[PDB]
mmCIF file of all heavy atoms in Angstrom:
data_model
loop_
_atom_site.group_PDB
_atom_site.id
_atom_site.type_symbol
_atom_site.label_atom_id
_atom_site.label_comp_id
_atom_site.label_asym_id
_atom_site.label_seq_id
_atom_site.Cartn_x
_atom_site.Cartn_y
_atom_site.Cartn_z
ATOM 1 N N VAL A 150 -4.280 1.502 20.643
ATOM 2 C CA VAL A 150 -3.060 1.518 19.798
ATOM 3 C C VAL A 150 -3.015 0.197 19.005
ATOM 4 O O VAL A 150 -2.356 0.170 17.897
ATOM 5 C CB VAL A 150 -1.835 1.694 20.619
ATOM 6 C CG1 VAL A 150 -1.283 0.448 21.213
ATOM 7 C CG2 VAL A 150 -0.708 2.354 19.692
ATOM 8 N N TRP A 151 -3.558 -0.960 19.498
ATOM 9 C CA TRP A 151 -3.437 -2.146 18.691
ATOM 10 C C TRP A 151 -4.438 -2.101 17.463
ATOM 11 O O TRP A 151 -3.993 -2.614 16.378
ATOM 12 C CB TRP A 151 -3.905 -3.355 19.579
ATOM 13 C CG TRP A 151 -4.239 -4.530 18.785
ATOM 14 C CD1 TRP A 151 -3.407 -5.448 18.154
ATOM 15 C CD2 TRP A 151 -5.554 -5.055 18.578
ATOM 16 N NE1 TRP A 151 -4.094 -6.456 17.555
ATOM 17 C CE2 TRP A 151 -5.486 -6.262 17.702
ATOM 18 C CE3 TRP A 151 -6.839 -4.673 18.988
ATOM 19 C CZ2 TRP A 151 -6.526 -7.041 17.416
ATOM 20 C CZ3 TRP A 151 -8.005 -5.464 18.446
ATOM 21 C CH2 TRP A 151 -7.797 -6.649 17.720
ATOM 22 N N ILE A 152 -5.493 -1.358 17.511
ATOM 23 C CA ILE A 152 -6.276 -1.057 16.322
ATOM 24 C C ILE A 152 -5.600 -0.105 15.426
ATOM 25 O O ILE A 152 -5.717 -0.125 14.222
ATOM 26 C CB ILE A 152 -7.705 -0.622 16.691
ATOM 27 C CG1 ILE A 152 -8.416 -1.647 17.582
ATOM 28 C CG2 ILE A 152 -8.517 -0.381 15.444
ATOM 29 C CD1 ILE A 152 -9.597 -0.992 18.361
ATOM 30 N N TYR A 153 -4.738 0.811 16.035
ATOM 31 C CA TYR A 153 -4.033 1.766 15.224
ATOM 32 C C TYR A 153 -3.017 1.122 14.395
ATOM 33 O O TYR A 153 -2.744 1.538 13.254
ATOM 34 C CB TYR A 153 -3.418 2.884 16.155
ATOM 35 C CG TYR A 153 -2.318 3.736 15.573
ATOM 36 C CD1 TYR A 153 -2.610 4.448 14.430
ATOM 37 C CD2 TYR A 153 -1.113 3.656 16.118
ATOM 38 C CE1 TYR A 153 -1.583 5.237 13.893
ATOM 39 C CE2 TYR A 153 -0.096 4.518 15.563
ATOM 40 C CZ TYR A 153 -0.316 5.205 14.399
ATOM 41 O OH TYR A 153 0.626 6.001 13.753
ATOM 42 N N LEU A 154 -2.375 0.046 14.852
ATOM 43 C CA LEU A 154 -1.421 -0.612 14.035
ATOM 44 C C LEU A 154 -2.021 -1.370 12.875
ATOM 45 O O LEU A 154 -1.415 -1.265 11.838
ATOM 46 C CB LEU A 154 -0.618 -1.644 14.918
ATOM 47 C CG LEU A 154 0.236 -1.042 16.030
ATOM 48 C CD1 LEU A 154 0.794 -2.183 16.891
ATOM 49 C CD2 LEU A 154 1.376 -0.221 15.490
ATOM 50 N N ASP A 155 -3.283 -1.851 12.996
ATOM 51 C CA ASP A 155 -3.952 -2.504 11.794
ATOM 52 C C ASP A 155 -4.128 -1.436 10.673
ATOM 53 O O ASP A 155 -3.759 -1.631 9.603
ATOM 54 C CB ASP A 155 -5.246 -2.964 12.276
ATOM 55 C CG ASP A 155 -5.284 -4.514 12.294
ATOM 56 O OD1 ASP A 155 -4.235 -5.209 12.769
ATOM 57 O OD2 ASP A 155 -6.338 -5.163 11.897
ATOM 58 N N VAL A 156 -4.805 -0.289 10.977
ATOM 59 C CA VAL A 156 -4.923 0.761 10.094
ATOM 60 C C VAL A 156 -3.698 1.382 9.533
ATOM 61 O O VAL A 156 -3.641 1.984 8.546
ATOM 62 C CB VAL A 156 -5.886 1.875 10.526
ATOM 63 C CG1 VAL A 156 -6.392 2.757 9.506
ATOM 64 C CG2 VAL A 156 -7.114 1.292 11.346
ATOM 65 N N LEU A 157 -2.564 1.200 10.334
ATOM 66 C CA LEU A 157 -1.264 1.614 9.848
ATOM 67 C C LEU A 157 -0.628 0.629 8.886
ATOM 68 O O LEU A 157 -0.373 1.067 7.678
ATOM 69 C CB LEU A 157 -0.353 1.882 11.066
ATOM 70 C CG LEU A 157 1.076 2.417 10.805
ATOM 71 C CD1 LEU A 157 1.018 3.877 10.362
ATOM 72 C CD2 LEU A 157 1.912 2.345 12.080
ATOM 73 N N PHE A 158 -0.492 -0.576 9.308
ATOM 74 C CA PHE A 158 0.339 -1.430 8.555
ATOM 75 C C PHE A 158 -0.568 -2.038 7.349
ATOM 76 O O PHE A 158 -0.031 -2.067 6.203
ATOM 77 C CB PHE A 158 0.774 -2.706 9.335
ATOM 78 C CG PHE A 158 1.743 -2.354 10.445
ATOM 79 C CD1 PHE A 158 1.736 -3.079 11.667
ATOM 80 C CD2 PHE A 158 2.717 -1.339 10.318
ATOM 81 C CE1 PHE A 158 2.627 -2.734 12.682
ATOM 82 C CE2 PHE A 158 3.594 -1.129 11.252
ATOM 83 C CZ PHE A 158 3.535 -1.761 12.481
ATOM 84 N N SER A 159 -1.808 -2.287 7.541
ATOM 85 C CA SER A 159 -2.622 -2.850 6.443
ATOM 86 C C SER A 159 -2.758 -1.643 5.336
ATOM 87 O O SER A 159 -2.699 -2.021 4.131
ATOM 88 C CB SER A 159 -4.070 -3.172 6.870
ATOM 89 O OG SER A 159 -3.808 -4.322 7.810
ATOM 90 N N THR A 160 -2.959 -0.437 5.825
ATOM 91 C CA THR A 160 -3.091 0.778 4.905
ATOM 92 C C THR A 160 -1.760 0.733 4.192
ATOM 93 O O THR A 160 -1.744 0.890 2.958
ATOM 94 C CB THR A 160 -3.360 2.048 5.556
ATOM 95 O OG1 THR A 160 -4.676 1.740 6.158
ATOM 96 C CG2 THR A 160 -3.457 3.141 4.664
ATOM 97 N N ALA A 161 -0.524 0.753 4.864
ATOM 98 C CA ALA A 161 0.720 0.875 4.213
ATOM 99 C C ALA A 161 0.883 -0.175 3.095
ATOM 100 O O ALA A 161 1.418 0.133 2.019
ATOM 101 C CB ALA A 161 1.825 0.768 5.278
ATOM 102 N N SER A 162 0.556 -1.408 3.481
ATOM 103 C CA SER A 162 0.579 -2.416 2.425
ATOM 104 C C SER A 162 -0.246 -2.140 1.205
ATOM 105 O O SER A 162 0.048 -2.382 0.087
ATOM 106 C CB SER A 162 0.303 -3.784 3.023
ATOM 107 O OG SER A 162 -1.068 -4.002 2.972
ATOM 108 N N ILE A 163 -1.490 -1.552 1.431
ATOM 109 C CA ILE A 163 -2.368 -1.349 0.347
ATOM 110 C C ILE A 163 -1.927 -0.202 -0.513
ATOM 111 O O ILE A 163 -1.860 -0.322 -1.793
ATOM 112 C CB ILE A 163 -3.822 -1.032 0.954
ATOM 113 C CG1 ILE A 163 -4.511 -2.249 1.447
ATOM 114 C CG2 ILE A 163 -4.683 -0.415 -0.237
ATOM 115 C CD1 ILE A 163 -5.794 -2.004 2.250
ATOM 116 N N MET A 164 -1.368 0.873 0.066
ATOM 117 C CA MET A 164 -0.752 1.955 -0.901
ATOM 118 C C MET A 164 0.505 1.458 -1.466
ATOM 119 O O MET A 164 0.893 1.899 -2.584
ATOM 120 C CB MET A 164 -0.513 3.236 -0.095
ATOM 121 C CG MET A 164 -1.501 3.626 0.994
ATOM 122 S SD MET A 164 -3.189 3.581 0.600
ATOM 123 C CE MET A 164 -3.343 5.158 -0.207
ATOM 124 N N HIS A 165 1.232 0.524 -0.808
ATOM 125 C CA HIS A 165 2.396 -0.144 -1.427
ATOM 126 C C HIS A 165 1.991 -0.809 -2.703
ATOM 127 O O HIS A 165 2.648 -0.702 -3.835
ATOM 128 C CB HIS A 165 3.171 -1.059 -0.542
ATOM 129 C CG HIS A 165 4.165 -0.417 0.362
ATOM 130 N ND1 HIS A 165 3.872 0.255 1.451
ATOM 131 C CD2 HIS A 165 5.519 -0.411 0.254
ATOM 132 C CE1 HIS A 165 5.021 0.725 1.944
ATOM 133 N NE2 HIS A 165 6.055 0.340 1.264
ATOM 134 N N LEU A 166 0.914 -1.587 -2.658
ATOM 135 C CA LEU A 166 0.473 -2.299 -3.903
ATOM 136 C C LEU A 166 -0.019 -1.313 -4.944
ATOM 137 O O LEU A 166 0.200 -1.465 -6.110
ATOM 138 C CB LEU A 166 -0.566 -3.307 -3.527
ATOM 139 C CG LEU A 166 -0.260 -4.363 -2.466
ATOM 140 C CD1 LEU A 166 -1.490 -4.945 -1.901
ATOM 141 C CD2 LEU A 166 0.541 -5.471 -3.044
ATOM 142 N N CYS A 167 -0.729 -0.267 -4.525
ATOM 143 C CA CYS A 167 -1.137 0.740 -5.429
ATOM 144 C C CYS A 167 -0.040 1.484 -6.159
ATOM 145 O O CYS A 167 -0.058 1.590 -7.339
ATOM 146 C CB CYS A 167 -2.124 1.812 -4.685
ATOM 147 S SG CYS A 167 -2.494 3.255 -5.664
ATOM 148 N N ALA A 168 0.978 1.803 -5.392
ATOM 149 C CA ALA A 168 2.195 2.443 -6.091
ATOM 150 C C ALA A 168 2.900 1.541 -6.971
ATOM 151 O O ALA A 168 3.386 1.908 -8.001
ATOM 152 C CB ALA A 168 3.113 2.991 -4.946
ATOM 153 N N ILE A 169 2.969 0.200 -6.586
ATOM 154 C CA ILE A 169 3.596 -0.787 -7.405
ATOM 155 C C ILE A 169 2.798 -0.932 -8.791
ATOM 156 O O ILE A 169 3.422 -1.031 -9.816
ATOM 157 C CB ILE A 169 3.640 -2.175 -6.735
ATOM 158 C CG1 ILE A 169 4.858 -2.208 -5.806
ATOM 159 C CG2 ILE A 169 3.791 -3.324 -7.761
ATOM 160 C CD1 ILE A 169 4.814 -3.307 -4.746
ATOM 161 N N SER A 170 1.475 -1.018 -8.709
ATOM 162 C CA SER A 170 0.612 -1.039 -9.912
ATOM 163 C C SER A 170 0.968 0.225 -10.790
ATOM 164 O O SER A 170 1.087 0.135 -12.025
ATOM 165 C CB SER A 170 -0.691 -1.182 -9.637
ATOM 166 O OG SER A 170 -0.980 -2.504 -9.280
ATOM 167 N N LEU A 171 0.906 1.439 -10.233
ATOM 168 C CA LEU A 171 1.183 2.589 -10.953
ATOM 169 C C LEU A 171 2.509 2.632 -11.602
ATOM 170 O O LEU A 171 2.705 2.921 -12.702
ATOM 171 C CB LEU A 171 1.018 3.842 -10.014
ATOM 172 C CG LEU A 171 -0.406 4.415 -9.887
ATOM 173 C CD1 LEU A 171 -0.548 5.235 -8.611
ATOM 174 C CD2 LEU A 171 -0.781 5.191 -11.100
ATOM 175 N N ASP A 172 3.567 2.197 -10.917
ATOM 176 C CA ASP A 172 4.794 2.136 -11.428
ATOM 177 C C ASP A 172 5.013 1.138 -12.500
ATOM 178 O O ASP A 172 5.621 1.417 -13.565
ATOM 179 C CB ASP A 172 5.926 1.773 -10.365
ATOM 180 C CG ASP A 172 7.307 2.006 -10.675
ATOM 181 O OD1 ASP A 172 7.544 2.635 -11.783
ATOM 182 O OD2 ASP A 172 8.253 1.545 -10.023
ATOM 183 N N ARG A 173 4.347 0.007 -12.490
ATOM 184 C CA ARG A 173 4.271 -0.965 -13.529
ATOM 185 C C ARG A 173 3.594 -0.409 -14.704
ATOM 186 O O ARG A 173 4.126 -0.563 -15.847
ATOM 187 C CB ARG A 173 3.538 -2.227 -13.117
ATOM 188 C CG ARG A 173 4.425 -3.271 -12.468
ATOM 189 C CD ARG A 173 3.601 -4.452 -11.892
ATOM 190 N NE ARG A 173 4.382 -5.386 -11.077
ATOM 191 C CZ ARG A 173 3.859 -6.276 -10.266
ATOM 192 N NH1 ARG A 173 2.577 -6.451 -10.134
ATOM 193 N NH2 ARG A 173 4.644 -7.086 -9.645
ATOM 194 N N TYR A 174 2.524 0.429 -14.539
ATOM 195 C CA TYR A 174 1.933 1.007 -15.624
ATOM 196 C C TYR A 174 2.837 2.004 -16.369
ATOM 197 O O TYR A 174 2.837 2.075 -17.548
ATOM 198 C CB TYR A 174 0.650 1.701 -15.324
ATOM 199 C CG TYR A 174 0.034 2.584 -16.428
ATOM 200 C CD1 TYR A 174 -0.355 2.104 -17.621
ATOM 201 C CD2 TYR A 174 -0.116 3.906 -16.151
ATOM 202 C CE1 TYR A 174 -0.825 2.940 -18.608
ATOM 203 C CE2 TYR A 174 -0.691 4.721 -17.024
ATOM 204 C CZ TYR A 174 -1.050 4.217 -18.229
ATOM 205 O OH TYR A 174 -1.591 5.070 -19.304
ATOM 206 N N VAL A 175 3.617 2.854 -15.548
ATOM 207 C CA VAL A 175 4.474 3.747 -16.183
ATOM 208 C C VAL A 175 5.598 3.028 -16.918
ATOM 209 O O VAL A 175 6.105 3.493 -17.953
ATOM 210 C CB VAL A 175 5.055 4.752 -15.135
ATOM 211 C CG1 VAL A 175 5.797 5.963 -15.818
ATOM 212 C CG2 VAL A 175 3.942 5.390 -14.299
ATOM 213 N N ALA A 176 6.018 1.855 -16.355
ATOM 214 C CA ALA A 176 7.155 1.152 -16.876
ATOM 215 C C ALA A 176 6.748 0.403 -18.139
ATOM 216 O O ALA A 176 7.611 0.252 -19.093
ATOM 217 C CB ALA A 176 7.650 0.092 -15.936
ATOM 218 N N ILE A 177 5.550 0.008 -18.373
ATOM 219 C CA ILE A 177 5.024 -0.822 -19.569
ATOM 220 C C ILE A 177 4.511 0.158 -20.642
ATOM 221 O O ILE A 177 4.746 -0.138 -21.782
ATOM 222 C CB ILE A 177 3.999 -1.819 -19.050
ATOM 223 C CG1 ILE A 177 4.694 -2.984 -18.378
ATOM 224 C CG2 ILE A 177 3.302 -2.342 -20.297
ATOM 225 C CD1 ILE A 177 3.778 -3.780 -17.420
ATOM 226 N N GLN A 178 3.884 1.156 -20.246
ATOM 227 C CA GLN A 178 3.194 2.061 -21.272
ATOM 228 C C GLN A 178 4.232 2.942 -21.852
ATOM 229 O O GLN A 178 4.277 3.198 -23.126
ATOM 230 C CB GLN A 178 2.150 2.943 -20.554
ATOM 231 C CG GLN A 178 1.294 3.900 -21.571
ATOM 232 C CD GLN A 178 0.650 3.257 -22.664
ATOM 233 O OE1 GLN A 178 -0.110 2.295 -22.527
ATOM 234 N NE2 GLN A 178 0.961 3.662 -23.925
#
């Protein structure tokens, strides 16, 4: 479960950044 948290939280942050970049592109374009 300690390895499960890594793949949970780090993934969550990575898709958070991906969604932020997509939203910025929609906002600027």
Side-chain angles (χ1 to χ4, degrees):
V150 85
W151 164 75
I152 303 156
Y153 163 60
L154 293 174
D155 249 45
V156 194
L157 183 69
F158 296 144
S159 300
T160 300
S162 79
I163 289 168
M164 331 306 278
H165 270 77
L166 303 161
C167 170
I169 281 165
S170 283
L171 272 159
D172 192 10
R173 274 174 184 165
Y174 168 60
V175 192
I177 288 160
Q178 181 61 53

